[model samples]
Target: STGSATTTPIDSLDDAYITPVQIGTPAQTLNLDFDTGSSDLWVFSSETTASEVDGQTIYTPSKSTTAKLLSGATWSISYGDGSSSSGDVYTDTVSVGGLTVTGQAVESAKKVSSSFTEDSTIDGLLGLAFSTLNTVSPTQQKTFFDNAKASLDSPVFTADLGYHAPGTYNFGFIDTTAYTGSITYTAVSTKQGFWEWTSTGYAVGSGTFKSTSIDGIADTGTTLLYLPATVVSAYWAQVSGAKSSSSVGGYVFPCSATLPSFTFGVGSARIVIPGDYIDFGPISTGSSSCFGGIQSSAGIGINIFGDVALKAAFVVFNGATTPTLGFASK
Candidate 1:
């Protein structure tokens, strides 16, 4: 029988969306950051180095009757943000909402970077990227979605990211009631193990849409929209007091500056990111300068349509046959 599930995401510091998932027997719950940029469902666990545990909730595999160590198996992952986690592997029952997947590979962290340890609100990360990207040694592990999709009515999932508000991630089906207007879809190039797609063009403020192609990935784990340096420079140029500073790292503008709306082409659909959303809080607390959420995709080598851009629209990740991405205004 086909199964479906809905997980509500909690807004985190206007930067990330965290969701709850139950693991093991007796259902130990953990708040995890759902990341589409990487593949590996890892959790802080009793195996984690005591110093790196910090305030996070740790999973004790011994307590779960279904948990079993995958002998000699290990996993390690590092993010563009410099956060990292590495650990041994265990197979256990993992459930999100009411949908459960048995024998799920759960990476139990034995070591973590300071960045991850300091993030007390999140217990771990649930990777939604292609299974090919999983970091399990010798043999890659399948993602929870991959294991569960076989029993789903449709091989599709929808992301409803919100700004300072609760959002939802619906799996195995698309909820028409969650979105308005027609959904515009484009072929997704998964050659890079990412939900990679090409944008038709873009417009800064009320400017005319430029007909240029930009290849990028839709990454829910990333907080800001990243583009080519030239594009980022051009946008900041329009702001009176905006400037790229080494100390602030990226473009910073006066708090009172009026920011123009930015729009990106999603095939025929125009997804508009609000100006207010562009100012990602102040550069420093109580400071008059604020950081722009749009930045250069230099080091990463790919533009990232991160949370700031994703929240502007309803996104469909169609995994059936040739993968495709569908977008519609929220």
Candidate 2:
């Protein structure tokens, strides 16, 4: 049994990443969002709906005396920008960091949306993917790393996102001082519940690398870096003043432009992504019109290596037995 955690950054740069979980029987804690593209651990409870609760923090299960209630179960979820939630189902004793998982299943929220009650600090969503993309309902629910991966001594998990700072997700070992070289593996085609792979092409600054394959999905809850709309218009035609703004939506450029540095070829390893992290900030706050963390997955049928390209490396989600991902370089 090994575990690790600490992944703040809800701002100050990368747009999302929270952590801290616990849940039930004298626990509570919250602050989730560890996503990996979906599985379902949901939260924000007391079965929400006090106007869908707003200042965050909730999960009461009658003050958890080991909360249980599967009963007729139920659950729902959605994302890819349209954020959503739905609930009912509990088991309890969750934990994180040093990992736990007694009854697990959790999933409270009694219907959220409005992008999760306007995100007061996101108090739900852990889903580390693959539990066959959980969503509860009649029966189906396991995450919490698949019920603590059979008491994990190493089922692997490591994300290290950092960019505007702070990251570290480790679980079941593999810190090696948080990376710096040789890790490059890859071959996870999980039929679609994500962590999917395939990218033997891309390049847009020092140009020329375009082998053009690109399947995608490495989403840690996606935060930009979608691709394929002709590779996001060939990286905004090398940005010089980029445009394509349907009311400030997608390729915008000029927050002092100059960007361009997005390489990705995985198998033979390439990674790269800098260009001030694809200028994904402006476009409104202090607007010089930025926004273009490399978009264009059109209707979102895949292609997403979000967090503007996995914050440039050090991934490794390897659920063993051929579910590989590795990556390095951070």
Candidate 3:
């Protein structure tokens, strides 16, 4: 009953959500979630006068100047998590950090559930996973990134992510100010809307084996790294006593001892995941105890490097020129 094992599954559904369209003018700015996991961006709107979604940040046009709502367009999206909401598609001016653009397409959730309709943190999500997962039909659509590229340097957007804690992570161009050391850059290939890469192999601490190669995808839509059973076993083999537990989905490993370090390969760079990240969520199936985060879905798909793995690095999806992906330190 914890996270599934193997690799996490990715839904390549068509219907892209555009960049967050700020309802106001240039004075105020609210960054939305660029999501690729599912189509549709539903921001907290004025319609929800009374709601109780704790920790959610709502998008109110009055708070800013660079925002707009399409006169007649309305939208809605349901996630695998079984929660759903509806809203209107509005064209508003928007800005990210120091950049600004006008007439960008965005969504405003008129009726959201208590889980997402409340809060004051991230007003909304801007799905950027893949094209197949787009929600808005083309005849009436615009992707958030397609419009934001006008102001972005190199028409390239990078995610300098940091999660599992509080604080906003910086994205866009690599900030030399925060990191001055050497940063490795790997190229990318864009299929659908998700930025993908060919992985070499995973590494943990001082252990590594590059004999096997993996064609991995760098998907912002996914939250975990889903690998094949052979890959998982190979990875666990690097450790001394790591064993696998049975589960419908997700990896169930014992928490009694320290699990081995887990890492996935992307191009020429190897990303190492901390022990805490690999520990599966706990469950009570028979006498065996399982962990939370790690699950087994191996063989179903190549490894998926999701938000967790991406949080520590800056991902650059260059669509203006050739389809290329670039990565650097966070």
Give the per-residue lDDT of model 3 (tens digit) for 1-330: 001011111211111112333345544334455554544545666654454445444556665555555677766677543556776776676555445546766677766655454324446666555445556543345565565655555565555444443223233454565433455556566664456667667665567455467666666655566666666666666545455644534445554756666666556665666766554444654535554343444544456666656655656566655667666654
The whole-model C-alpha lDDT of candidate 2 against the native structure comes to 0.83
lDDT of 1 by residue, 239-307 (tens): 999998888778899999999999999887799999888888787789999889999999678899998
* lDDT (Cα, tens digit) per residue for candidate 2, span 75-174: 8887767878887887989878878879988888888888778878888888887988798988988888878877888898888888887787888878
Q: What residue runs in model 3 are displaced by over 4 Å at the alpha carbon?
A: 1-40, 48-57, 61-68, 78-84, 111-122, 129-133, 138-140, 163-172, 177-187, 236-249, 280-292, 298-302
Regions more than 4 Å wrong, model 1: 1-12
Give lDDT per model, in order. 0.88, 0.83, 0.54
Residue 104, candidate 3: C-alpha displacement in angstroms: 1.6
Any idea how many clashes model 1 has?
Answer: 0
Judging by TM-score, tell me the better candidate of 1 and 3.
1
Poorly placed runs, candidate 2 (over 4 Å): 1-42, 53-101, 105-114, 118-124, 127-143, 151-183, 186-202, 205-219, 226-237, 240-262, 265-268, 271-291, 295-316, 319-330
* Better candidate by lDDT, 2 or 3: 2
Q: What order do you get sorting by lDDT, best first?
A: 1, 2, 3
- Against the true structure, candidate 1 reaches a TM-score of 0.97
lDDT of 1 at 132: 88
Maximum-lDDT candidate: 1
lDDT of model 1, residue 314: 94
